[PDB]
A paper describes a structure:
To provide structural insights into the methyltransferase reaction catalyzed by the MTase domain of METTL16, we solved X-ray crystal structures of apo and SAH-bound METTL16_291 (METTL16_291/SAH). The conserved SAM-MTase core (residues 79–288) of METTL16_291 possesses a mostly parallel, seven-stranded β sheet (β1–β7) organized as ‘3214576’, with β7 being antiparallel. Although the MTase domain of METTL16 has a canonical Class I MTase structure, METTL16_291 has several unique structural regions: residues 1–78 that precede the Rossmann fold as well as residues 95–97 (ηZ) and 188–222 (a putative loop containing disordered residues 188–214) within the Rossmann fold.
Structural comparisons of apo and SAH-bound METTL16_291 structures revealed that the cofactor-binding site in the apo structure is occupied by four water molecules, which serve as placeholders for the following heteroatoms: (i) amino and carboxyl groups of the homocysteine moiety, (ii) 3′-hydroxyl of the ribose moiety and (iii) N1 of adenine. This disulfide bridge is present at approximately 40% occupancy in the apo structure and is absent in the SAH-bound complex, likely because of radiation damage and/or the presence of Tris(2-carboxyethyl)phosphine hydrochloride (TCEP) in the protein buffer. Comparison of the apo METTL16_291, SAH-bound METTL16_291, and SAH-bound METTL16_40–291 structures revealed significantly different orientations of the 184NPPFF188 motif. Additionally, the 184NPPF187 residues are adjacent to a disordered region spanning 189–213 in the apo structure and 188–214 in the SAH-bound complex; these residues could not be modeled due to a lack of electron density. This disordered segment is one of the elements that distinguishes the Rossmann fold of METTL16 from other SAM-MTases. Hence, it may play an important role in RNA substrate recognition and/or orienting molecules for catalysis.
Residue numbers in the entry: 3 to 188, 214 to 291
Amino acid sequence: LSKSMHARNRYKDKPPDFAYLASKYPDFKQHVQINLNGRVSLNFKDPEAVRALTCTLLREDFGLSIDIPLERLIPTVPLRLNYIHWVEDLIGHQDSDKSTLRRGIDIGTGASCIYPLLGATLNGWYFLATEVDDMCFNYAKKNVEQNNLSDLIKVVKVPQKTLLMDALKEESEIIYDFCMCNPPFFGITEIMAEGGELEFVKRIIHDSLQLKKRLRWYSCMLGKKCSLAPLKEELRIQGVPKVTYTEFCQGRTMRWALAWSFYD
Ligand code: NA
């Protein structure tokens, strides 16, 4: 039993084989080197190499061709898969059949559009995928297009200071099964400032208090350990009836997943 990865994550017992990938993908091979053990390795501080790994895994394991810039966040695939499988568990996906269409929202989808591409590819899930950043929007839209998934994934550029509520008016589906979200990167006064991550997820909580049963589950993936406790307390204060959380990692890269619901 793994403590780092979701039980159904394909990389849980089959980690990426860099020698295999280098043998097959010349664009990947040019970014690898040999370590002191004589093993094929990669410099994870180098964005070109990290990009090549992500693009290569998506191609090899998921049949997805993506194009992304060096100047925006490059996602790490094994880590992201944990969140997809966790959402599967939240919504009861393992125990239903294909006749049930699911509808998600990815808040701040990124240049990769990685959550919608994985969810649409693996499960046939629909996504509304929002993005404030122009470059990320443009890339996301092309990545969905080039993988022929625009009937499942609607990529939408949204204004700088809007979130879930603004995205879901008369245009919307009646009920969504979930939202997902990776938050964006961010001796005198005793009180610590909330910081970017806590503030951002509190905005989602605030929107959920309006939308209530229009989404079955609200979720986020947290990058700061210190986020989880205050967000649980804010959900308690507001009387949110169903709260669940879990923890994943990939090596030293740790994440805390938090989800809540107004259903019984
Ligand atoms: Na494969």
